[model samples]
Target chain A: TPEEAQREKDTRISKKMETMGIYFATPEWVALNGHRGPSPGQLKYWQNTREIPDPNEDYLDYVHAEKSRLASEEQILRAATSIYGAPGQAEPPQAFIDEVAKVYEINHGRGPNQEQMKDLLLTAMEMKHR
Target chain B: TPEEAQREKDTRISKKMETMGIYFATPEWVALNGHRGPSPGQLKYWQNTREIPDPNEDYLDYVHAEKSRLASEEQILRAATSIYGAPGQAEPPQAFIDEVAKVYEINHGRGPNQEQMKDLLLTAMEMKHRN
Candidate 1:
């Protein structure tokens, strides 16, 4: 098994165009002379064989995109949760936060306070209720 | 209620800065003189009142980003399902597909066929099994 692992590693590195499982065939070598399973009424031939076809090119592309999207979801959830104590709770857009800080900076000649931030948040929440 | 709808619609169209419920104060006209709810332990004050504060700016921003991400997910899921019947199944990446096409184009002087696509897919599956 250890020797096999090295062989796999060596082959994998060299095969950059292939996405681990799927590959392009040579004129003579379809998958390093591997079997592609029996076809249509070749029941006895498949009865002894026990595997599905390798994943398709389109399938791998979908997997890559799905994984990336989930990663983004995780990043955003953590970012929102850190600020607001809960991820799903709504946070205000940047424009509104920017406006509040802008006013505070002009008046005090300093960065806005957390207390000041709440002033606008509270106002919006109250307005929404009506 | 119809008259009220007209009033809300007219105000909504005019106040672009304000996101429906949230707003900036006017030194004297904070959200058209809106209330911002009772303070801590002003229980009696809140008992008479029956509403929480409007959603804050950060909350809306998060909502917008999350909604966009979900829309993208829906689009991809549909795309995958139409091709392969299921979205979550592992499909091979595109580089391999392009290589197959490249080889086919050289040999046949034409676009690759679906039958050709399977030869590579089968090899990969069998190889993965050994690992």
Candidate 2:
């Protein structure tokens, strides 16, 4: 069963253009399913019994770079929001802003001492679309 | 009240069902007892106001599992004890060979590199047994 599970997991990883790239895939996201699992089930059925595939054209690297950039930006927003309740990217698209605000609200509730980096990003978004 | 606490946590998927079933029902447990915070008098009153019954069958199954799962396996015995050196069960119960042959006893602290892959299961019996 473990073997089968591993095989299925490997198949899913190989087919993804994302995996074939140079992007960094953190252990945390792997455990969290990358917010995309159902897409691979279809691919796995097609690629069943196939050898594990390689990343296509440094795609993984690109994904990691983008994620790192985005995460850094988010961190800045969070820091600003924590101190001032305002990030540079405020005035973001209202809907997106609200969703991000919701993210911050939920995290603030769970976060130790109401600390939330993600929520700061939303504050930044609010600035952008405001 | 949702204000009294944040929304309850999301439940778990299957196969996580273990010595305890479903999520540990932390909300129910918290309501069922004044374990922390609030006054000593507030616990029962809170329970009464919140409509928690006695620790009936539903409450019993629903509350804490009485213990956490076994933290680690004991390697010394044939069946193995806990990490704390408590002996686990054995078909060869009495006068049993408990010592797992001190590997470094004779080989100048060097012998065939015998490695055993350990099972990583948590048994929380010891701590959870407290009254």
Candidate 3:
């Protein structure tokens, strides 16, 4: 009976391998390796992205994207802090306006209109909470 | 001491849980269950797809999509079979033309022009091999 079960298992695995290529892995293999099996939706997503992308490749791409996202947020926070000053002391209004002007020119190729200045101040305020 | 090792392990796991939410699973747990820990790439894909989609939900979606894909392919093969016939019994040309005309009209709101008819027959021919 054990032999028969083994044979059945092999057949199932073979079928899956044929259909899914390198993506195929037995449930037992998944469990023993300290990883959980992918769900159907995950499988569909993988298939859509690639026939079956390498695990290492996928992980690296995510790490790169995440690092960039966090770094940009940190940069924003630093800018906010410099403009707003510490709890006791505020940067002078003229200096702040000058700084904001430079930022606007960099982005828009011209100094801020009223609307653009309002937007810059709003973003700086939002970054302060972070 | 064993206590120190455990504390270190807990700290590592806790950090992962903080970053990954419900997707976190201990390496020891995965090993015991027959799973291999995910590589960095796999982790990235999973994170991109969802903050952490439940395994069961992901599995169901894949199965549903797979079924739909196969069913459509099968439908194509059936139509090909009817037009081409089994092995050597090709259907009448006029009948085939009429059937194809209807399919083209349904899809394009007009019977296929010469170029469209040629394209449809080419696809049907390719499907013949599968049948």
Among these predictions, the greatest lDDT belongs to 3
Model 1 ranges off by over 4 Å: A1-11, A14-71, A87-130, B1-72, B80-131
TM-score of 3: 0.15
| Leading candidate by DockQ | 1
Give all TM-scores, in the order shown: 0.22, 0.14, 0.15
Kindly give the stretch of ten consecutive residues in candidate 1 chain A with the minimal lDDT sum.
A64-73
Ordering by lDDT: 3, 1, 2
Please report, as a value between 0 and 1, the fraction of native contacts recovered by candidate 2.
0.00
Q: Summarize candidate 3's per-residue lDDT along B6-25 as a digit string, tens digits.
A: 65665565446434531333
Looking at model 3, residue A70 earns an lDDT score of 11
Q: Give each model's clash number.
A: 20, 32, 25
lDDT tens digits, residue span B84-103, model 1: 32235654334333333232
Better model by lDDT, 1 or 2? 1
Clashes of 2: 32
| CAPRI quality level assigned to candidate 3 from its DockQ score | incorrect
> How accurate locally is residue B47 in candidate 2, as Cα lDDT from 0 to 100?
24
Lowest lDDT 10-residue stretch of candidate 2 chain B: B116-125
